[PDB]
């Protein structure tokens, strides 16, 4: 049987990180097969250096790994696939370091054989912290790249449409993002966070646009927004992401669309609006009511007195005086431990990866 380790000569360490990190292509057929392969290879290399009791070699590899991943993302950090790939692999590397740490708290899902593969000489808890902090940075980068890709699509897809962007453009792009993350073996709980963040951005940009234009507050637009949100919700359902928290991030937009469709005349109508619009600030509620356009001659505009009644009712809210959502808010990310069933002693390195100078142990 193999031990589940990989040996390399110290003089080949730079060649190792060159071929495994700096020049590794995330779209290669050989790394689709085992999502996380770079992380598993690195860990198996750490295992052997640990087995040799070689603290200097373990440090050099671990330091070189962080430096190389940072280098790749400085050079190709605007490519979503590259950022996703290295986020996924940084996380898998972190999970490996925990799963095979020898700490009982991380071994509950291990097979007996996997428990045989724990590190024996070095406690890498401090490195795990460094790696976690890197993953946070990569995640922030990923959010920024996805945001930049979606931004040109959002107002036309969500508000204007009843090269060129529609709701279907947004859905196609979300499908592409999600497929890529899945192909990379990104943790399901991390994909959920990414999707929550993307939905937040969609909702914030949409609502802010609605509040800044003069032509988006009508009953008909409310209907359109409702429909578009319903399609985003169906996308979540199809991807089994309805517990991601993503739908809940759209509450301000959802409430604005509802506000467009309710009656806006009586004291009872005002009470109802105050009861229903918990996710909108007073300024947002008042803005929408001031912008509202009647559907035809049988509907009227909202009166000044009605608007003042809303203000009076909401007077004791700890309300932010702000009008616009902060579309650059990023929810704090977490990387909950996700052990894998992959047996290290069975992992083969594809010959096409150019790592023939590494040896299986």
């Amino acid at each position: 049987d193999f031990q589940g380790m990989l040996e390399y000569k110290k003089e080949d360490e730079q060649k190792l990180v060159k071929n495994l990190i700096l020049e590794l292509k995330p779209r290669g057929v050989a790394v689709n097969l085992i999502p996380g392969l770079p992380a598993y290879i690195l860990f198996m290399c750490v295992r052997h250096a640990d087995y040799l009791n070689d603290d200097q070699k373990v440090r050099s590899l671990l330091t070189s790994t962080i430096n190389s991943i940072k280098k790749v993302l400085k050079k190709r950090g605007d490519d979503f696939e590259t950022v996703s790939f290295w986020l996924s692999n940084t996380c898998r590397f972190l999970h490996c370091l925990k799963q095979y740490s020898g700490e009982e708290g991380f071994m509950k899902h291990n097979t007996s054989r996997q428990n045989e593969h724990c590190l024996t000489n070095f406690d890498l808890a401090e490195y795990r912290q460094v790696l976690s902090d890197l993953a946070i940075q990569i995640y922030q980068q990923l959010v920024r790249v996805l945001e930049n890709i979606l931004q040109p699509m959002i107002v036309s897809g969500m508000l204007e449409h009843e090269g060129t962007y529609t709701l279907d453009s947004i859905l196609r792009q979300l499908n592409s993002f999600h497929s890529v993350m899945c192909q990379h073996g990104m943790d399901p709980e991390l994909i959920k966070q990414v999707v929550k963040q993307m939905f937040y951005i969609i909702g914030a940009i949409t609502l802010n646009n609605l509040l800044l234009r003069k032509d988006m507050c009508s009953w008909s637009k409310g209907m359109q927004i409702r429909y578009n949100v319903s399609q985003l919700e169906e996308w979540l359902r199809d991807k089994n992401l309805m517990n991601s928290g993503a739908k809940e991030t759209l509450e301000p937009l959802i409430q604005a669309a509802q506000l467009l469709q309710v009656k806006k005349k009586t004291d009872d109508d005002a009470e109802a609006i105050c009861s229903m619009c918990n996710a909108l600030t007073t300024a947002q509620i008042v803005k929408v009511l001031n912008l509202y356009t009647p559907v035809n001659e049988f509907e009227e505009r909202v009166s000044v007195s009605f608007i003042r009644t809303i203000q009076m009712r909401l007077r004791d809210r700890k309300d932010s005086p702000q009008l616009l959502m902060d579309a650059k808010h990023i929810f704090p990310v977490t990387f909950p431990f996700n052990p894998s069933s992959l047996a290290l002693e069975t992992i083969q390195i594809p010959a096409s990866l150019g790592l023939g100078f590494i040896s299986r142990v």
Binding site: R59, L124, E126
Partner: peptide
Amino acid sequence: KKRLLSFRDVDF
């Protein structure tokens, strides 16, 4: 017992 391998900025 395993030995804690130290990580600080200067290592990187």
